[PDB]
From a paper:
One of such hot spot mutations, KRAS p.G12R, is found in 17% of pancreatic ductal adenocarcinoma (PDAC) patients, accounting for more than 9,000 new cancer patients per year in the U.S. alone. Here we report the discovery of covalent chemical ligands for the common oncogenic mutant K-Ras(G12R).
Compound 4 was bound in the Switch II pocket of K-Ras, with well-defined electron density for the covalent bonds between the ligand and the protein. Surprisingly, we observed an imidazolium structure where Arg12 participated in a “side-on” orientation with its ε and η nitrogens. Such an imidazolium adduct is consistent with the loss of two water molecules revealed by whole protein mass spectrometry. The nucleophilic addition from the η nitrogen also appeared to be stereoselective, as the electron density clearly indicates the tertiary alcohol to be of S- configuration. Compared with unliganded K-Ras(G12R)·GDP, the side chain of Arg12 moved closer to the Switch II region, and the Cβ-Cγ-Cδ-Nε dihedral angle shifted from anti to gauche. These are likely energetically costly movements compensated by the reaction with the α,β-diketoamide and represent opportunities for future ligand optimization. The conformation of our adduct also differs from that seen with covalent K-Ras(G12C) ligands such as MRTX849: the adduct is formed further away from the protein surface, and the amide carbonyl in our structure did not participate in a hydrogen bond interaction with Lys16. An X-ray crystal structure reveals an imidazolium condensation product formed between the α,β-diketoamide ligand and the ε- and η-nitrogens of arginine 12.
Numbering used by the authors: 0 to 169
Write the structure that this text describes.
Amino acid sequence: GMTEYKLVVVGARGVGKSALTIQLIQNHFVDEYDPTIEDSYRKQVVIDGETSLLDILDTAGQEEYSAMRDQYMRTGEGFLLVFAINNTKSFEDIHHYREQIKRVKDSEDVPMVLVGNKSDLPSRTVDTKQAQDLARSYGIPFIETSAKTRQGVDDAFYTLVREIRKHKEK
Ligand SMILES: *[C@@H](C)[C@](*)(O)C(=O)N1CCN(c2nc(OCC34CCCN3CCC4)nc3c(F)c(-c4cccc5cccc(Cl)c45)ncc23)C[C@@H]1CC#N
Ligand SMILES: Nc1nc2c(ncn2[C@@H]2O[C@H](COP(=O)(O)OP(=O)(O)O)[C@@H](O)[C@H]2O)c(=O)[nH]1
Ligand SMILES: [Mg+2]
């Protein structure tokens, strides 16, 4: 049979949320994608032998806090926390995103993966060690990705799926 997973991708504008999602869904790199479009994308994949339907909310929009937005976000079973390794502000923003996740899920135990995107770029500003300690302090996996070269893209989403499965066992 099959299993469905609702994934939500969050992080600062321009970190590559849409590029990452389109790599997962369409298996190529799309370097210009309207920064204002928020939508959900599907894709069925086999992950550890199990047919997995991924429903991925690529976030955009305004920074508004309302019960409507909380309702969309609360539907997510797991979250990708995305920063760009060449943008320190996007990395500093991660703490805020995780807090809003914890708020709408009413739990500190929410499946999440920390994703340092743009690993293909030469002028890294966020050290891999800084990111690993942030993920360790959250108790979550960390992966560096490049939506440009597709490095780590599959594993980032599949690791999040594996984190959800565990959480569902409780
Ligand atoms: C680009 C800049 C354009 O405006 C855009 O597409 N954005 C920016 C606004 N969005 C947004 N931003 C933040 O954080 C911005 C930050 C970080 C520290 C706090 N502030 C002020 C300026 C920098 N946070 C957001 C949200 F938290 C949500 C949201 C709202 C309610 C509930 C939940 C629950 C879980 C997760 C999230 Cl993301 C929730 N929405 C937007 C938002 C939107 C977009 C960037 C993104 N993603
Ligand atoms: N070099 C490089 N550029 C990227 C990568 N991912 C996204 N980009 C670029 O970063 C910008 C923002 O990407 P986008 O997918 O729109 O980010 P979003 O706002 O988080 O949806 C665009 O110019 C993309 O071409 C990556 O892994 N490597
Ligand atoms: Mg986008």
